[PDB]
């Protein structure tokens, strides 16, 4: 029945770890770098 069926998919899926992540820029630095990546050669 539907009471049994509930909660399937999240439990069902084969989860994968999120592994190695390098830290991002913040703030003015992040915005400036983004501005340069979008708009300099690529604008």
């Amino acid at each position: 029945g539907s009471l049994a069926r509930a909660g399937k998919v999240k439990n069902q899926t084969p989860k994968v770890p999120k592994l190695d992540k390098k830290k991002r820029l913040t703030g003015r630095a992040k915005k400036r770098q983004l501005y340069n990546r979008r708009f300099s050669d690529n604008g």
Partner: protein
């Protein structure tokens, strides 16, 4: 009782957020002026808008009206004190002529970069932030400090800084000195 000091919000939000062309124009302003937040643009814009609203109210009010001519002379005099209006601009229609870049140029980081004390707007911002600038013998930590007309050439390094000609004294510099001293001893 409650504290009787006043307080006010720095800005007005620009609404309708995903106006791409407007958003990219703000990003160009961030890129140019060494700003950390859209809120920085919005506060300077809010100040400009307050000025623009005042200037509109004055110019809409009649010629030779006593409040208007007094407040108008006072406003223009203040624009002269700030240096926001310079030599060649001298009436309320030039206040309407004022623009958001002109206000942004008044920021201390822009002045520091312009004078060439630092190599970039960001380098200028950090130089100010590290308490290493001084304006007229006053040490200042605020990169958004809006200079007056006189004070623009009164900008030089903080006295007790390395760039002031005092001690660096840094953990690195001291560590090198200890290494040399231990080597010699």
């Amino acid at each position: 009782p409650k504290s009787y000091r006043n307080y006010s919000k720095t800005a007005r939000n620009p609404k309708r957020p995903f106006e791409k062309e407007r958003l990219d124009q703000e990003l160009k302003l961030i890129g140019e002026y060494g700003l950390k937040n859209k809120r920085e643009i919005w506060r300077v814009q809010y100040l400009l808008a307050k000025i623009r609203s005042a200037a509109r109210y004055l110019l809409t009010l009649d010629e030779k009206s006593s409040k208007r001519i007094f407040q108008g002379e006072a406003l223009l005099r203040r624009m002269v004190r700030q240096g926001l209006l310079g030599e060649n601009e001298e009436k309320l229609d030039y206040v309407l002529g004022l623009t958001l870049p002109k206000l942004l140029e008044r920021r201390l980081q822009t002045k520091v970069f312009k004078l060439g004390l630092a190599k970039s707007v960001h380098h200028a911002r950090v130089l100010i932030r590290q308490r290493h600038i001084r304006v007229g013998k006053q040490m200042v930590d605020i990169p958004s400090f809006l200079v007056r007309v006189d004070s623009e050439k009164h900008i030089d390094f903080a006295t007790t800084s390395p760039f002031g000609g005092a001690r660096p004294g840094r953990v690195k510099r001291k560590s090198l000195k200890k290494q040399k001293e231990k080597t010699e001893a």
